[PDB]
Amino acid sequence: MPADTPSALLALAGEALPELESLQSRATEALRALVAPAGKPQPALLEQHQHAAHALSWLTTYVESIRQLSGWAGRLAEAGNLGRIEALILQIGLGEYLGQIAGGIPMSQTEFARLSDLELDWQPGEAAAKLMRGNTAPARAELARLMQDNHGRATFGATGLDEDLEMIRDQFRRYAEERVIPNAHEWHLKDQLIPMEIIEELAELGVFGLTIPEEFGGLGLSKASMVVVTEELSRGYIGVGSLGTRSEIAAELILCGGTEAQKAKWLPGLASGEILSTAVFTEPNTGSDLGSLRTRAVRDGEDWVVTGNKTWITHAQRTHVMTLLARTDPETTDWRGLSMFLAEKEPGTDDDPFPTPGMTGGEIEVLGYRGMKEYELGFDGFRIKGENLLGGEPGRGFKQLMETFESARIQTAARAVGVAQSAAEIGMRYAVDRKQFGKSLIEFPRVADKLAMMAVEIMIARQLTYFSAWEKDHGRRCDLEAGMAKLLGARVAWAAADNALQIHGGNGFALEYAISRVLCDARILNIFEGAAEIQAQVIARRLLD
Amino acid sequence: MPADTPSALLALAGEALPELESLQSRATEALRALVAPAGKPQPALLEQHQHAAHALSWLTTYVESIRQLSGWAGRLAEAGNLGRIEALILQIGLGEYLGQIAGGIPMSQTEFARLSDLELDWQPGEAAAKLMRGNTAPARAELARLMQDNHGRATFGATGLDEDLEMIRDQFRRYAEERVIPNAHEWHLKDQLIPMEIIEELAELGVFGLTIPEEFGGLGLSKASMVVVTEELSRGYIGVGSLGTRSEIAAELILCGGTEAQKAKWLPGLASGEILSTAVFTEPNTGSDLGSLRTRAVRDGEDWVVTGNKTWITHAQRTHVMTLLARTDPETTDWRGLSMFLAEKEPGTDDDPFPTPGMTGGEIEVLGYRGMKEYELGFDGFRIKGENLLGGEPGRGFKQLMETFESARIQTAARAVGVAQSAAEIGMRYAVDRKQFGKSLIEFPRVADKLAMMAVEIMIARQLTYFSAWEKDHGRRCDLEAGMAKLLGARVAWAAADNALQIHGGNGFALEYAISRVLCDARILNIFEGAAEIQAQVIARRLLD
Numbered sequence A, B: 001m002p003a004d005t006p007s008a009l010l011a012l013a014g015e016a017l018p019e020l021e022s023l024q025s026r027a028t029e030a031l032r033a034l035v036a037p038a039g040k041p042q043p044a045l046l047e048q049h050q051h052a053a054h055a056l057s058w059l060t061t062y063v064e065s066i067r068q069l070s071g072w073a074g075r076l077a078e079a080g081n082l083g084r085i086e087a088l089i090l091q092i093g094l095g096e097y098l099g100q101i102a103g104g105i106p107m108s109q110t111e112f113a114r115l116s117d118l119e120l121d122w123q124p125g126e127a128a129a130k131l132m133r134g135n136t137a138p139a140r141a142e143l144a145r146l147m148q149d150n151h152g153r154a155t156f157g158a159t160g161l162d163e164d165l166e167m168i169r170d171q172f173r174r175y176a177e178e179r180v181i182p183n184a185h186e187w188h189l190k191d192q193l194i195p196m197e198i199i200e201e202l203a204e205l206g207v208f209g210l211t212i213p214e215e216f217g218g219l220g221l222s223k224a225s226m227v228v229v230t231e232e233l234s235r236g237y238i239g240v241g242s243l244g245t246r247s248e249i250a251a252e253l254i255l256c257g258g259t260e261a262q263k264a265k266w267l268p269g270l271a272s273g274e275i276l277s278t279a280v281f282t283e284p285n286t287g288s289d290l291g292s293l294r295t296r297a298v299r300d301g302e303d304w305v306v307t308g309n310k311t312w313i314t315h316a317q318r319t320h321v322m323t324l325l326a327r328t329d330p331e332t333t334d335w336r337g338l339s340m341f342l343a344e345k346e347p348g349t350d351d352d353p354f355p356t357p358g359m360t361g362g363e364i365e366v367l368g369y370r371g372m373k374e375y376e377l378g379f380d381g382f383r384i385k386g387e388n389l390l391g392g393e394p395g396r397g398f399k400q401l402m403e404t405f406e407s408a409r410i411q412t413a414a415r416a417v418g419v420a421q422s423a424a425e426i427g428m429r430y431a432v433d434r435k436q437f438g439k440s441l442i443e444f445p446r447v448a449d450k451l452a453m454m455a456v457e458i459m460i461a462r463q464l465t466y467f468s469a470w471e472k473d474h475g476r477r478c479d480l481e482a483g484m485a486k487l488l489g490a491r492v493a494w495a496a497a498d499n500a501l502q503i504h505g506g507n508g509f510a511l512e513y514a515i516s517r518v519l520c521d522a523r524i525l526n527i528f529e530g531a532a533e534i535q536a537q538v539i540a541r542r543l544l545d
């Protein structure tokens, strides 16, 4: 098998990459001719040709996925760590992803990105054609066997992360195994918030200030460190991972956009978990087109008064501060008129969730288990102190929010990887333990192949995510890469949960089996931090640059 | 001349079909050489090569899908009824399904049936190559525009069914609109069984005896008639459709396997709805491998006494009879030792669901809304009258059950079509009503394309289903075709619900929005009447014959 000679496999992958880059360039030029025939992209043409544009985004995502998978394996080889399971992941992943470039990439279950969507043709060269045959029955069977015999390891295949990061992984995996995994079914059954004891435990471990500078009471750790924490917490339960994301994003928003006084006032309390935050952006009629939002903030002396409706707000009851985006210029309808507020409020109780004056709200009944809950909120004369307009100058809120998009995308990808990993582990356990026709289910290729493809796609998404974090940790622009990781990761997690449920048969629908909950968790990933359609749009516009 | 007029499309489809049949033959021969190298299929080789075997099943499903889509349009044209929406469904369907034959058919989100899985290659002929380019952006956009102007019609495109069948459609569509759609959210919120008043109304409508002969109090209508009823009831709510399916299958079981006295005693009460039935087959440890089940039945005088555990049993509380499969020969381990019983019991109450002696049970807590509920059942010396052994002779139960498989598969496909249609209609409503970026969502191709592809795949699945019913109604063997309809239809419904949820954004997860429930309903379709993996296995074995 090709995996028997990993050095030859890496060499072929390097030989094949140039034609994939050329393909992406032809695709980009083709899109430009459709949507920007005179130079400037025309909105009506971008809209008409949206399928082709998003096909460019997904094609590019697959080229970068191939680049990062090959790079991962190359760095393992340099370290002497390109072992059999990893070589099979490389073989199968190159085979499958090249094959989908040639035959169709699923943007959604029924929308495929095909080369014909941009009138492109690709005749694979010798190396690419050979690699394209790598996703074989024997390779998948062997991969599934090694997954079964992976006892003791936290991932299917070495990740290539350095030792300090894998020790962080092991710390937060032990936490999830002790305090999250044994308890999530009870939380679901009781329809209850993640217990405050979990928040307090994570706060003492430094989760809420992991990446906040030490000057403000944080740990000053890398974004890669936060990815690993988030992946492991989310493997336990996505909402536990999102507790850490919310603090990390609010803190970046303030670090990048706040006055020095705001940094000193807010960051220590976020870092200790004494101040819990959530984002208050979405409105009943405005979600994807956030620049057009309608909640208004009106001056009253040196302070502000807010009126409007917000919805889909996570963790709205227990938080002390809302990063609240409102329109401060009534003569505007676009992003320029927006300001961001650190809207302090009093945490509520189950029977009195919104005691602060001028604020009302109610829980939204949501599919699955939502451990921070989501809420509709009404603001009617809600007061915000002048000193809590972030940065002090009105009309900068949307640019301040955009400064958080790299991290938000990275953290959504990290959550997706953790959810996907949970689905694969749950599926594997059932496939080994469940007997049918006189043997474990994993002996049947339709079961084992599902698990093999999970391990491959999880590693592809993981390496895209880790590359994005690497770039961010070096201070380089990484919005494209982080967006690709978010786009691919959400799909990978959804497919992994869907196919893990299949392995369970009828038991996959029983609430007693965790996969029923994991399915619902995975489904939110391509919506809750922005729809995949919009993420593909933003990537395509950047690629035309 | 233009190559995309209806005349040209039908001519090209006829020109392309022979090479598709040759591809299917080549694939069958290839599979045979892999799994039956000496003549007899070898179980170990069928297992090793299960992906290639199931790829043959899905390839064949797509060739038959293309054949029936082309046939449908040709019959419309003979009647002057191949209008624009139908011609676009033909165009886009042929383009997409030919493209997937060439590039990969999704068996699941990550498992693709590719020609390379059987070491085949295909160089499309002139006609097939032209047709493969027909799923274009302008075509999808025009289809989505026509779907918005559909005149309150019950389908997107004419079905080709006769006027009597379409009058049945209108009646049951009106019932679902008036009595099911306005009430299903309340049923879910109360976690309650479909009300008995709904059952009484369906019984008055003749649903429970629609296909039972008139000499037994039924209406004596065709299987296609029952498909239409089931589709429209399921569009309302899958469980309402399944009430009808359960009677239709129990009646067929008795009509084909019962003594004359059993027919006379049981059929009139099934037909009137005075006797409600469910199937009692699955056990905690035995589902797909039903021939190995362990529940036992032992003679006691002229009667039988049953001991064992059953699970995943739908509607177990309120039924009067269970079609119960048990092992009557303790020296056996396979299907030969099984007998089918018409196991009469007393319907229960919420408080006391299982008042009959020797039977206990409890509801399984299940994802989504299960309006007949599913139960775990225990039998300990449960009595069955000797006259209730179906057919009077032990050891014929599995063969009697197999007599119902054609109908069961057809009715599963019909439920799937109805669920898929619901998702498409719910998605369309939201896509038109929801504004974002200053226009309705349906103006964006990522939204409109999802809906267009639903209409296409729904019609493809509908025509496969209707072909299977046509064959059954002429008394011809149709197990392959019915299985194909079930295989494709479940996937189409799942994809339709997934993409319709996407169109809703965050609101797709709110229980207030019906799509959250429909997602869960669609997911069961490829498990609840048998796993898709097993359906593909059965098809492949038959194709090898």
Ligand SMILES: Cc1cc2nc3c(=O)[nH]c(=O)nc-3n(C[C@H](O)[C@H](O)[C@H](O)COP(=O)(O)OP(=O)(O)OC[C@H]3O[C@@H](n4cnc5c(N)ncnc54)[C@H](O)[C@@H]3O)c2cc1C
Residues within 6 Å of the ligand: A278, A279, A280, A281, A282, A285, A286, A287, A288, A289, A311, A312, A313, A314, A315, A374, A524, A527, A528, A529, A530, A531, A532, A533, A534, B434, B435, B436, B437, B441, B444, B445, B446, B447, B502, B503, B504, B505, B506, B507, B509
């Ligand atoms: C569990 C959950 C938690 C959330 N947490 C928060 C939170 O804490 N704070 C907060 O503010 N918000 C939160 N959100 C809101 C989330 O950000 C929005 O749901 C998301 O931005 C999508 O917006 P929308 O729901 O209004 O969908 P819409 O904008 O109405 O779009 C609906 C669908 O239409 C498609 N679409 C829209 N526009 C286009 C276009 N131009 N081109 C092509 N397709 C398009 C997309 O498929 C999209 O999903 C949460 C949502 C969920 C589900």
Ligand SMILES: Cc1cc2nc3c(=O)[nH]c(=O)nc-3n(C[C@H](O)[C@H](O)[C@H](O)COP(=O)(O)OP(=O)(O)OC[C@H]3O[C@@H](n4cnc5c(N)ncnc54)[C@H](O)[C@@H]3O)c2cc1C
Residues within 6 Å of the ligand: A434, A435, A436, A437, A441, A444, A445, A446, A447, A502, A503, A504, A505, A506, A507, A509, B278, B279, B280, B281, B282, B285, B286, B287, B288, B289, B311, B312, B313, B314, B315, B374, B524, B527, B528, B529, B530, B531, B532, B533, B534
């Ligand atoms: C909502 C619901 C309603 C139901 N209603 C009824 C009812 O009323 N009466 C009744 O008797 N039963 C009912 N069932 C049970 C249903 O028939 C079984 O769930 C189904 O047959 C699958 O069996 P299982 O769950 O034991 O899965 P298993 O047989 O344990 O299989 C688990 C998974 O393994 C895979 N698999 C298994 N075998 C193979 C193989 N040889 N090759 C490849 N892959 C394989 C499949 O993906 C399968 O889904 C219902 C189930 C559900 C979910």
